[PDB]
Amino acid sequence: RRKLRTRRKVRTTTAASGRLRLSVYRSSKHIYAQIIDDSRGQTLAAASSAALKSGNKTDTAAAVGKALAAAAAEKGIKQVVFDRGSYKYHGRVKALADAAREGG
Amino acid sequence: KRTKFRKQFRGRMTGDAKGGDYVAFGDYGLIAMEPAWIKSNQIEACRIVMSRHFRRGGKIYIRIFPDKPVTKKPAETRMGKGKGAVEYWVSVVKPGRVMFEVAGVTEEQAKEAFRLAGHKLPIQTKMVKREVYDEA
Amino acid sequence: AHKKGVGSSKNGRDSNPKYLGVKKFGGEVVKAGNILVRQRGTKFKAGQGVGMGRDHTLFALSDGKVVFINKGKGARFISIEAAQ
Amino acid sequence: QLKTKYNDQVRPALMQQFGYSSVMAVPRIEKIVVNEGLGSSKEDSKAIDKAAKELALITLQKPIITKAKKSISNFKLRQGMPVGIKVTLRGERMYVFLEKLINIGLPRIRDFRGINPNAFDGRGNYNLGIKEQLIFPEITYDMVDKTRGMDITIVTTAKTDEEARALLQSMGLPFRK
RNA sequence: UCACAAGGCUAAAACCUUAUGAAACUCCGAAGGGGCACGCGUUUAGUCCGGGAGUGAGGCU
RNA sequence: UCCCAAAAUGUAACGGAGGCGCCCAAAGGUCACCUCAAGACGGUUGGAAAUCGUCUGUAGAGCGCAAAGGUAGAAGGUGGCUUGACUGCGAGACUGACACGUCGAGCAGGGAGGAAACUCGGGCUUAGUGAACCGGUGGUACCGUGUGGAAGGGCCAUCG
RNA sequence: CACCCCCGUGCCCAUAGCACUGUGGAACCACCCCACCCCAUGCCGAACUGGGUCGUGAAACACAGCAGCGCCAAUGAUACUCGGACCGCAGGGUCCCGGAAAAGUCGGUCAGCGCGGGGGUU
Ligand SMILES: [Mg+2]
Ligand SMILES: [Mg+2]
Ligand SMILES: [Mg+2]
Ligand SMILES: [Mg+2]
Ligand SMILES: [Mg+2]
Structure with a gap:
């Protein structure tokens, strides 16, 4: 159940890593794919789909991942760690990663 | 009297009454003025004494209970282990504690019934009445 | 050999050497490795820069201040806040 | 099969029968749970396979072998031994088995007058008691070993027994009036 | 958790009002104690290396 | 292990209680997923608990065994793949009169699971143990009585 | 912090929680819809997961009300107690001097401080 997000989130051992967190809200057909810095309660990058998607909803999969990888690279965000909700890392969510992994 | 099941053996120590009101249940009561170990048979004496005096009613509240094992001298020894559980059961009674309280019987029908019970007790006592409102 | 028990009931000599407790306290200059707590379960859970050994023992990862x-109460943490 | 007659004669009828302001507030049928409770008296390595064949033909779903809760009581009670058999039905498979009942299963029952209409699962859910087995369309003595019985439960989105009972009757349900 | 006092209640377990006991019970919890840093002070010991020991029956409050 | 033990540690008794001299190639590594005991109402074997269903439900369950601590964001319960139940080491501590005993970041060689951050040098932890001597077995080729071999020894490993 | 609001995520784990009454829908979010394959249920697309609208905000979520329950909780006095000094054969008890609970009572709360993106002020 809801235990899944807290399970995946807690296993993402925060400031011991040094690395930044990569949230994903793949629950709807509107993401948030945020880049959150562990230490300061602050969000650095982030790329959504609510305002303009070009018609796509589960197809925009790579686009929003590619958009974020580009959006981060501007600030110099190179080292990062991903965090799914209850998301099994397979389609809509696996794309966002594979598009960021290849997009820088 | 004795308890149903437990641990077997205990220990011993003392200081002023913890949980013992004055009223509740009955109208008149009996209060310990000295710290003691009230034997099971000691209470069973008081019950019987007060019981007889009232004849019919049984409106006697025994607030104390022998929740405590005491041990004894098999014959002499010392060379050997811990002692016999089965000597007696006791209720540790510190001054202020209500041991007994009576209902429905008159002022004198109680002054005397408690006076008799006192004579079966190892400690100084006193009779009590009303105006004890902490919780009800 | 008689029908009575090989093991005689009712004993008490039995007990064990036994240790434990907190080793480094709030406001102490630790070196790296220095044990901060010896415990059974997780009385204190590992905090920032503090490792947890197999027997729930809590050790320092880097030099600093405890x-x-x-x-x-129920969730307790020991961490290191370096002087550097 | 079905689903539309569930709407047409029940859905607008209930919004008029009661006072529903939404088509989603109107009660539905969540699931039909089929539970076989063999074992204890029928502890056979052969009986487990037998119940599966009978069930996988009426419901057309693979049945789970709901093992013992590791309880070791005075009587015949132990660890993880196969005891009961369960099959949960939803959607088409639920509707196919439900239709196989009201139209074929239910009338083809010996000593039949209807089912107990009293307030069952207080929070609007129904529990059906089937005393026999040789009453179903796919259940015949020509391909079975002996004789048995079974238990079925209806899960509804109804808030009370009042709303649940009505939903069942209009859907087609025999009651002992 | 275990033990337990008067009553309600119900088909006794539970549950409710009033009422308690606890080394191996604890929703709480002191005074004290212990570690560390500092010495605003006042003192005077400590640590380490090497020679020689004796003592490892204690007694009362 | 718990109590005695006087809220740091430690602390005695022929003081109060109880367990151990193992077990597990999965009960280990890892990665995924799952969430309990009990009650009430309703249901075919049954009818006291029970296989099912829905409400309540920080745990009243579980954790191979004793107990205490601990634990559901799992240490509980399922599965996929795998043996890190590795070799060479050990910054710095704990703890002991010593001899022992414990925890251990990090470095190398080779790997295992994962997409990855990573994690893994046995098991949620605290019991399942035995110095040294003499000898068994596998490796190694250090000594070897003038020299070169060999017998014998030494060194790792391990058994009694 | 232009003023509101919604979705993510956080510090903070009850003064943040529950129940009960209500406001919310075409912006967001949920159910819903179908699903043959990626991939998945020791049985079932309940769940994961894939393809999208309407319909309805029902249920869930979000906000707002309220002190019935939880939760927090004084002041006073007390228990106890460091130190000082005593009584009693004893169980036990006292006086001075500072430290000072627990329970209860008054009363307090239907939280508070962030970062990012979305939508409105016709
Ligand atoms: Mg309180
Ligand atoms: Mg003083
Ligand atoms: Mg004094
Ligand atoms: Mg004296
Ligand atoms: Mg004082």
Whole structure:
């Protein structure tokens, strides 16, 4: 159940890593794919789909991942760690990663 | 009297009454003025004494209970282990504690019934009445 | 050999050497490795820069200064806040 | 099969029968749970396979072998031994088995007058008691070993027994009036 | 958790009002104690290396 | 292990209680997923608990065994793949009169699971143990009585 | 912090929680819809997961009300107690001097401080 997000989130051992967190809200057909810095309660990058998607909803999969990888690279965000909700890392969510992994 | 099941053996120590009101249940009561170990048979004496005096009613509240094992001298020894559980059961009674309280019987029908019970007790006592409102 | 028990009931000599407790306290200059707590379960859970050994023992990862975090009671943490 | 007659004669009828302001507030049928409770008296390595064949033909779903809760009581009670058999039905498979009942299963029952209409699962859910087995369309003595019985439960989105009972009757349900 | 006092209640377990006991019970919890830093002070010991020991029956409050 | 033990540690008794001299190639590594005991109402074997269903439900369950601590964001319960139940080491501590005993970041060689951050040098932890001597077995080729071999020894490993 | 609001995520784990009454829908979010394959249920697309609208905000979520329950909780006095000094054969008890609970009572709360993106002020 809801235990899944807290399970995946807690296993993402925060400031011991040094690395930044990569949230994903793949629950709807509107993401948030945020880049959150562990230490300061602050969000650095982030790329959504609510305002303009070009018609796509589960197809925009790579686009929003590619958009974020580009959006981060501007600030110099190179080292990062991903965090799914209850998301099994397979389609809509696996794309966002594979598009960021290849997009820088 | 004795308890149903437990641990077997205990220990011993003392200081002023913890949980013992004055009223509740009955109208008149009996209060310990000295710290003691009230034997099971000691209470069973008081019950019987007060019981007889009232004849019919049984409106006697025994607030104390022998929740405590005491041990004894098999014959002499010392060379050997811990002692016999089965000597007696006791209720540790510190001054202020209500041991007994009576209902429905008159002022004198109680002054005397408690006076008799006192004579079966190892400690100084006193009779009590009303105006004890902490919780009800 | 008689029908009575090989093991005689009712004993008491039995007990054990036994140790434990907190080793480094709130506001102490630790070196790396220095044990901060010996415990059974997780009385204190590992905090920032503090490792947890197999037997729930809490050791320092980096030199610094010991800080204790008592989150309401039930969730306790030992962390290191370096002087550098 | 079905689903539309569930709407047409029940859905607008209930919004008029009661006072529903939404088509989603109107009660539905969540699931039909089929539970076989063999074992204890029928502890056979052969009986487990037998119940599966009978069930996988009426419901057309693979049945789970709901093992013992590791309880070791005075009587015949132990660890993880196969005891009961369960099959949960939803959607088409639920509707196919439900239709196989009201139209074929239910009338083809010996000593039949209807089912107990009293307030069952207080929070609007129904529990059906089937005393026999040789009453079903796919259940015949020509391909079975002996004789048995079974238990079925209806899960509804109804808030009370009042709303649940009505939903069942209009859907087609025999009651002992 | 275990033990337990008067009553309600119900088909006794539970549950409710009033009422308690606890080394091996604890929703709480002191005074004290212990570690560390500092010495605003006042003192005077300590540590380490090497020679020689004796003592490892204690007694009362 | 718990109590005695006087809220740091430690602390005695022919003081109060109880367990151990193992077990597990999965009960280990890892990665995924799952969430309990009990009650009430309703249901075919049954009818006291029970296989099912829905409400309540920080745990009243579980954790191979004793107990205490601990634990559901799992240490509980399922599965996929795998043996890190590795070799060479050990910054710095704990703890002991010593001899022992414990925890251990990090470095190398080779790997295992994962997409990855990573994690893994046995098991949620605290019991399942036995110095040294003499000898068994596998490796190694250090000594070897003038020299070169060999017998014998030494060194790792391990058994009694 | 232009003023509101919604979705993510956080510090903070009850003064943040529950129940009960209500406001919310075409912006967001949920159910819903179908699903043959990626991939998945020791049985079932309940769940994961894939393809999208309407319909309805029902249920869930979000906000707002309220002190019935939880939760927090004084002041006073007390228990106890460091130190000082005593009584009693004893169980036990006292006086001075500072430290000072627990329970209860008054009363307090239907939280508070962030970062990012979305939508409105016709
Ligand atoms: Mg309180
Ligand atoms: Mg003083
Ligand atoms: Mg004194
Ligand atoms: Mg004296
Ligand atoms: Mg004073």
